Ligand binder design. Sequence first.
Ligand SMILES: Nc1ncnc2c1ncn2[C@@H]1O[C@H](COP(=O)(O)OP(=O)(O)O)[C@@H](O)[C@H]1O
Ligand SMILES: Nc1ncnc2c1ncn2[C@@H]1O[C@H](COP(=O)(O)OP(=O)(O)O)[C@@H](O)[C@H]1O
Ligand SMILES: Nc1ncnc2c1ncn2[C@@H]1O[C@H](COP(=O)(O)OP(=O)(O)O)[C@@H](O)[C@H]1O
Ligand SMILES: [Mg+2]
Lengths: 266, 266
Amino acid sequence: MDIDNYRVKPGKRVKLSDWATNDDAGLSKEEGQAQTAKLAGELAEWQERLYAEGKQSLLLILQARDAAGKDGAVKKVIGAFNPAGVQITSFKQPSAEELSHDFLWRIHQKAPAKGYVGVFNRSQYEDVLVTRVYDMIDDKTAKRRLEHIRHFEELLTDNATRIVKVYLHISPEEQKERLQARLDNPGKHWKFNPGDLKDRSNWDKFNDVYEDALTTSTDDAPWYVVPADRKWYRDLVLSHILLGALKDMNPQFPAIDYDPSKVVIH
Amino acid sequence: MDIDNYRVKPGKRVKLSDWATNDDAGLSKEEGQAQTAKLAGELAEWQERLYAEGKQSLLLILQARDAAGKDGAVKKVIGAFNPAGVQITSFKQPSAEELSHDFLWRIHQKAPAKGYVGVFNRSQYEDVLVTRVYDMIDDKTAKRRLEHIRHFEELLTDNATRIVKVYLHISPEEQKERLQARLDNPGKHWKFNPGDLKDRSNWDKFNDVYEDALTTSTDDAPWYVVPADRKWYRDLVLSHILLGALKDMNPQFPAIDYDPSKVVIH
Ligand SMILES: Nc1ncnc2c1ncn2[C@@H]1O[C@H](COP(=O)(O)OP(=O)(O)O)[C@@H](O)[C@H]1O
Ligand SMILES: Nc1ncnc2c1ncn2[C@@H]1O[C@H](COP(=O)(O)OP(=O)(O)O)[C@@H](O)[C@H]1O
Ligand SMILES: Nc1ncnc2c1ncn2[C@@H]1O[C@H](COP(=O)(O)OP(=O)(O)O)[C@@H](O)[C@H]1O
Ligand SMILES: [Mg+2]
């Protein structure tokens, strides 16, 4: 398994048809889940070092279609961290106050603080995705917003915020099964709504706007196209993406301002 | 077991000395850890239902002395929840802007939203604890603030926010062991500073002000004194306290207003 094959290389436009949705790296469901469990412990040790150092931060931007596994990726992978060093934000339709500001106003407010892991379940890229498919903005506006997004991610990069953008990539047939599954199991009826089917009818339009958004992939702010047909594999790759980022950040425990040898606890 | 022995009953004044610090309910560390692990799954099932329903909220208020187990209780017990349905806040020294407002301003801002679990690592009670030991306020101010806190907790209770306040109860000699360990292990020097020792020298003054604070215990907003000398036991009791609240709240999955069988996913 080379995780870098899933990284959108800088400057190269992408075709979603050229990326697989159901890779498994020649691993069984058990070998993957077992390895994902071992990585869960590794993720925790490094998230503790990140919080102790208090100099850097990690920002995961999760973008995907309905039933792709955003909720499951957070519950399984992000659940490995100490929840006190994590901040999760699920961006839904902008409120009235949010619309009275530029489109990055509400986004910037949730940027992670030093020492924290930040997650955007849906993010600023919504403003150049669903907003385009349904003609809330035109191509001119969309293009400029993408330039504004790059600069925003460049701002946070110089602030020591390591950016990682992940797109969970599934096939239409896999989505069909998962949507039918929510309709068949009484316990999950609440996760399905008459409107997940509208975005489905515009599947090919979302391909175009998603491929546009992926052009923001740089060395400092990379995109990853993660085959997500297999949920265990989705979790396994994301485990590798986040831990590999954490290890490259190499957070060191903080210095002390006292002499331990000379302290007398009364 | 009986968790109700650890609940400060309404209207009755208490002395912390009346509670043991190293209870175990006749369980070994292993049988306890096993029980804590078995309950983690139930906490998760009910936290998902609470978030799915979106009508109620759970507020945990954590108060405890140095090396008593605030961070460890959160990492172990609160770590059972999906971090997307949780909000943790560690209240430190008030900032300048926070001091320019009433003492509950920064607290109220962090009240949990419907469907969420909220945790306060240190809380509004700091304003009637450390503020008194070091003569930042007088007895008259402290007494009135305690009334304002009860009203505040009554406000959130009528909002369907289930309040639960926990005090982790350890002995001085256990604190001495835990602090000396950080001075002895180089890997833990960063968790200690010669300032953790100031509150320790005023242990008996904190007894008085903590015992005053416990009088806000009501049927709706109870306090709990949890013997915390044994770290595995702290985690076991807190799991029971929080799961008992979630089960008593009894959050229900939301009903649907459509017929899944006649939905046609093209
Ligand atoms: N900036 C934005 N402008 C318009 N719509 C947005 C924006 N950001 C998010 N949304 C929309 O909010 C909705 C949130 O859906 P959500 O309830 O999270 O779906 P599910 O829970 O089924 O995954 C999405 O349909 C998304 O397109
Ligand atoms: N010296 C140590 N040995 C073993 N575990 C430790 C040590 N120091 C801290 N821990 C871990 O940290 C937790 C204690 O949390 P702590 O930081 O004392 O909370 P508080 O904020 O009240 O000081 C323990 O449950 C344990 O998991
Ligand atoms: N409302 C408040 N007024 C005055 N001091 C406060 C208040 N809330 C918290 N503090 C103080 O802030 C300090 C935070 O200590 P620190 O060790 O940095 O936090 P923690 O141990 O919780 O990680 C504590 O000594 C506490 O007394
Ligand atoms: Mg939905």
